[PDB]
Design a protein around this ligand. Structure first.
Ligand SMILES: N=c1c2ncn([C@@H]3O[C@H](COP(=O)(O)OP(=O)(O)OP(=O)(O)O)[C@@H](O)[C@H]3O)c2ncn1[C@@H]1O[C@H](COP(=O)(O)O)[C@@H](O)[C@H]1O
Ligand SMILES: N=c1c2ncn([C@@H]3O[C@H](COP(=O)(O)OP(=O)(O)OP(=O)(O)O)[C@@H](O)[C@H]3O)c2ncn1[C@@H]1O[C@H](COP(=O)(O)O)[C@@H](O)[C@H]1O
Ligand SMILES: [Cl-]
Ligand SMILES: [Cl-]
Ligand SMILES: [Cl-]
Ligand SMILES: [Cl-]
Ligand SMILES: [Mg+2]
Ligand SMILES: [Mg+2]
Lengths: 376, 207, 378, 378, 207
């Protein structure tokens, strides 16, 4: 019995996982993303530098017996990318990708995994919406290569709209924290109540009530909010990405400007990609942190239920016939077997007359001095 | 491509090869004339086929662009089969290399001018007869050359002798017998013998 | 600053590591090994079931916040293979492979890694030396695919020879522990001294002095030892694997029957593959208990192959920013079709965001000259 | 445009070639071979004394303007070694090595070189198989020093087996020439046909069919052949060298007793060393006539090693023009002392003539920073 | 340098080693004290000598900067001789590791504070006696520590016991016997055994 949220990935699923990890990584590399493979463990000083409290609680701690210092098993690779970019990246544009195991102390959603295989891509050093647009095109090129029947639905948000309203309204921390709870739960009635006594309250109500209708959202806001340069641009970025997703990718987009998960680290646009009607996003992405950064990541293991490989060719050599061979005949047979394996056939040399591979599709059999493949 | 590549000669040779292939594992899915395709799949997934000019087969095999091939012995002698193994006499597409001149015409009192495709064979043959010759290279219609004075004799492949007789020519000397041969690339013979042996044995059994 | 024995693997090395991990795994699969990918963490009840004390000390502990029970970060994947084989493997022959990260509390060797990328293969349910022979064929097929100039040297041992002598001689634990220390340190003189007063002492001296000469080892042992069925077979297995390695694989083999590392877990033949003159084995393998269920297997740190392998230099391409933006829509779609084809072939092509956007290690520009996009070396 | 089979060797390849030539020669000298350096040209009387017809056609002719006599540019150094051994070698054992350019009128293989850098070693005056074994040890010590990832495969033959069968069977020249053609082309079916009507025909079939299995070859031959002392010894020599190659040197060996290239000059055992899957042997060797004086030897084209070997990347240093000219005399002498020391270590240091003087492949500048000359990577 | 590099301990150990060397092929040309030289040639051209701190010998051997060396068993136990072969007990520079406190002074009713160079040995010894100790690291003059209150006991090498008695201390527990040992680098043992065996056999014969 494994711990809750911890599962083996076995056999054909393991092969599929390895194929997905490799093919997605290679695609990223061909789009000019530099692969990096940081370690599972670091000192907490680097691993949790500027981390949120959720990330800290999500990170297992262990003690280094060589120094007596605290280390952590990573719950997120993104902070390691920042460390790497700071040392190696320079001032210009730098692109990175990665794929590695991460460990969580608690599952993120209901019945979630605590050991995802985290794969992702990140662009540093570009302020333009063009960097976000490029990331979308890479993501959707990757998704379309998987030939899934499952549909991805995208929810866009933008944390700057709420952050600017909170500045202009001069909200206290407890008022900010209450609205975030009400937004998280879309408690519209109680949000209506609280907003009647808050400064610029009707703006905070409008986000929740009408934030879905992004074309008209600016015109529903107060004159102070409509005069704020950062709100107008954030709303404009949402409209630009929505349009790009619909037109270039035939992608259903919803907008939610009250999506404020990772209030700590997100600095702008945010992206949540849902797979069919599954509760937790398959893809999470957005702007984050003077050096610009944007990126996404996903759990490769969640793609397993939505992808299929071609059926494998699983071959068994006849035990009796192989042992009847002279040395020269065996070397010719092994040459033939090496060539079959080079082509991706899975060929078992039997140890005994009962040795049978799981999922046998073919036998390699001798008929009149010729080894031929026959289906079972 | 990890299987064998088989180089076949396009014209007269291809007709008599097809029965030998079908007896082995190999037979073409399409037809060479109807299709404007260079590389042909076969009934055997481990064998690929190239339909080439008869003159190009030894080149493709020797450089390893084909693993093995069927080629006329006239082509091999003219080419110099230095870097290939001549494994089997297939005994198909049989003919003779011969000299031919105009019917009853006398040999002139000078170095004989030989018009031929087979310039190395001509030179070699006439050297073995202790004769010095001026060789003229041609690619087609050898029959014509003596009729307009281009050479005194020709060297060409002869089967029935009807093409020579229909143009007022007669055969003079027999140079050698010719048949299509099975040639194999030196490296392929070592590295892909497992794939080759069953095909080699079926060709051997087919004669 | 990372902790000792912990390093980033960056850029071309990361790409190389990913290629090695993938290609070696695929090879294992084509030899009929079923890939499994167990988790990094488990309850200690399963992860350290029948573990040695070294494995226990090598395993980081953490607490499960959902149950309050102890877990570990794996230091070794092999015990997870046993768990999997017990549930899924049945009574017959079962083959497994794996490649995953493991964490160690302390390094094994001087400046060794604490985070190896552990890759391995295991056969359960076959008692015959033929299963060990098959593992050697898989290993060497993998090693030869790497096209290294570095030479792998193999040292074979067999812990049964010493274990059976210790039984027949009826050695106490302290006598067993002293001989193991003397063997570990090659202290031949002091071994000679101790063996003059021990029962079957000359046999324990003979292992150390003459164990390298495996052809003649049985004939140097005492009549009681030569009549023991398990000693005769163990020596026979050593000769079989030595021969197979030399003849089939052109491999230099040494024999050391006093090699008693992992006395606890090894049950028979043992294999240590060394790379050039590096102290810690690249490959460790041998017979162990699959439970009565036979097991044999090897593993290695894929990250130690990085220094001894080379990929072809990458093609790193930049599309000209200015020329691309001058294009009409149909011209752009033709260019992107061309780019897709280059990427399918493994070219690394950057679509520039700005006129300064330059990839690291640029080898080529894709440039427009008279209505034609060609690659030009920089 | 150079002639076919003629190429410049430039820059890092030229440096590599010079290192290989020097290091391999020095190794040969340390194994006790005396270096000789005969001239490129000689009178044909000595250069082609007892030469095959292939060697004669391979040798360019030129006229000596001092005597009006014919000379040749050497295509092979071995006949010059014989001349030297006849004058200086005496009756005992003599060992020679060499490395020199030779010119061929036609290439041997497809796109082969007509100007190899021929390096070799030869032992005269020893009939024993021990001399051939020593040559193998020298060769493989040399090959292993090159640290190649490319694998050398060795094919052994022995022309005496066929020569003795041809004697005992009393074959005519045309029968001998036909079998050699059939052997050369592996035409087993037609060989089977011809051997049914020849005397001792089944022996000539057995060589081709079963000659690869050298352990059992003597026992497959006819009673007349098994009673021939020269056949029994030749087969024994093959088994000895095969074993030595596998065990001492981890070398894959094949046997081919129908390998009858150089029927003219080989007198016994023959050795052909192949590199990966390249058609023409990298190394050719075997027994030949040293005259009664025994000789054995091998040679190879050093230029064919260039594609399979690597040197460490060079350090190419430029001294800063401006900073150097700012120095007083004492400062310049200190800098030049530093430069001399760097050059002693193999750094390639350019003293610039002008401010634009830049060496090809610049890796480092030697620059002045606060009264200190340090190397900085570019 | 292709020969053997020999790591010797500087002080007390060096005096009793010199006779063992001379019986082998090895003897120093200069003297260690008079010369300010780090690397010393010997009578044998294949052997080189390094005169090192006793504490540094195991480090040099384990990393392969020396091929073999002479080192105190007290130093090896404290260092952890994990990556070297302890080939011979030379039976020279003999002494004991012991505990020592003030003469007739009572043990306090608390965790014992141990002042020592040998912190791993101290911890290990007191752990084997089921005692928990607070260890204080020192590099010299262990005798002093108990006299000014720095610890309750010390751990140090004792031969005659005169240094302890001259400072008002007495020995308490015997931890283990100590002598200089011959250590060899794992890799050197395989690669340079031909050079080593005659020296190893002469050391063996010298006792
Ligand atoms: N009879 C043959 C003939 N017999 C066998 N072969 C083989 O076929 C190969 C040439 O094949 P092709 O048919 O492609 O060549 P081609 O017909 O000479 O020239 P193409 O116009 O096809 O290029 C030669 O290499 C021979 O090995 C022959 N190739 C050509 N011929 C010609 O066919 C005609 C028939 O000759 P008679 O039967 O004597 O009248 C004459 O023109 C012959 O020269
Ligand atoms: N008696 C020894 C002694 N005997 C053998 N050895 C060995 O010598 C090694 C240390 O050599 P050194 O002489 O260089 O070390 P040191 O004298 O402790 O310190 P230094 O000032 O030399 O650095 C140890 O590792 C032992 O293996 C000894 N090392 C030190 N001593 C000291 O010598 C003094 C004599 O002790 P009593 O004879 O008991 O009075 C006491 O201070 C002891 O601690
Ligand atoms: Cl006619
Ligand atoms: Cl490992
Ligand atoms: Cl040469
Ligand atoms: Cl005392
Ligand atoms: Mg293991
Ligand atoms: Mg020669």
């Amino acid at each position: 019995m494994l711990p809750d949220g911890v599962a083996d990935v076995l056999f054909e699923d393991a092969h599929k996982q390895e194929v997905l990890r490799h093919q997605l990584t290679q695609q990223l590399i061909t789009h000019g993303y530099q692969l990096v493979s940081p370690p599972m463990i670091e000192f907490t000083e680097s691993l949790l530098s500027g981390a949120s409290e959720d990330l800290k609680r999500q990170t297992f701690k262990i003690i280094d017996q060589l120094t007596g210092r605290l280390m952590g098993i990573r719950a997120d690779i993104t902070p390691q990318i920042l460390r790497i970019d700071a040392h190696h990246g320079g001032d210009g544009i730098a692109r990175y990708c990665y794929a590695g195991d991460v460990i969580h102390t608690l599952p993120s959603g209901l019945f979630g995994s605590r050991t995802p295989l985290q794969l992702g891509a990140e662009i540093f050093g570009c302020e333009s919406i063009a960097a976000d647009i490029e990331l979308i095109d890479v993501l959707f090129s990757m998704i379309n290569s998987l030939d899934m029947s499952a549909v991805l639905h995208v929810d866009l948000g933008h944390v700057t709209i709420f952050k600017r309203l909170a500045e202009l309204a001069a909200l206290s921390a407890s008022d900010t924290e209450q609205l975030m709870q009400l937004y998280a739960n879309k408690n519209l009635p109680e949000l209506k109540q609280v907003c009647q006594v808050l400064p610029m309250g009707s703006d905070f109500y409008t986000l929740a009530r009408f934030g879905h209708d992004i074309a008209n959202l600016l015109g529903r806001l107060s004159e102070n909010a409509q005069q704020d340069t950062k709100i107008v641009t954030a709303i404009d970025e949402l409209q630009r990405l929505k349009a790009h997703l619909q037109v270039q990718w035939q992608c259903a987009v919803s907008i939610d400007v009250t999506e404020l998960s990772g209030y700590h680290y997100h600095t702008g646009i945010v992206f949540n990609g849902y797979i069919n009607s599954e509760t937790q996003p398959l893809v999470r992405g957005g702007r984050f942190d003077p050096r610009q950064a944007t990126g996404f990541s996903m759990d490769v293991s969640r793609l397993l239920a939505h992808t299929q490989l071609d059926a494998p060719f699983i071959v068994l050599i006849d035990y009796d016939a192989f042992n009847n061979l002279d040395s020269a005949q065996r070397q010719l047979l092994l040459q033939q077997v090496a060539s079959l394996r080079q082509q991706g056939y899975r060929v078992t040399m039997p140890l005994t007359a009962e040795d049978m591979p799981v999922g046998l599709t073919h036998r390699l059999s001798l008929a009149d001095n010729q080894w031929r493949l026959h289906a079972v | 491509f990890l299987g064998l590549t088989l180089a076949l000669s396009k014209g007269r040779i291809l007709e008599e090869t097809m029965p030998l292939l079908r007896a082995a594992g190999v037979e073409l899915l399409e037809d060479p004339e109807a299709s404007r395709k260079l590389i042909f799949p076969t009934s055997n997934p481990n064998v690929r086929v190239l339909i080439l000019r008869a003159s190009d087969v030894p080149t493709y095999v020797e450089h390893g662009a084909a693993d093995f091939g069927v080629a006329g012995k006239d082509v091999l002698l003219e080419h110099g089969a230095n870097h290939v193994y001549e494994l089997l006499d297939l005994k198909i597409a049989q003919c003779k290399l011969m000299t031919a001149g105009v019917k009853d015409a006398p040999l002139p009192n000078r170095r004989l001018r030989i018009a031929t495709k087979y310039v190395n064979v001509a030179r070699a043959y006439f050297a073995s007869q202790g004769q010095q010759v001026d060789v003229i290279k041609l690619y087609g219609s050898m029959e014509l050359a003596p009729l307009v004075g281009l050479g005194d004799l020709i060297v060409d492949v002869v089967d029935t002798g009807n093409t020579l007789r229909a143009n007022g020519l007669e055969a003079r000397d027999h140079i050698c017998d010719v048949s299509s041969r099975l040639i194999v690339n030196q490296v392929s013979y070592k590295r892909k013998f497992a794939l080759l042996e069953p095909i080699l044995d079926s060709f051997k059994n087919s004669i």
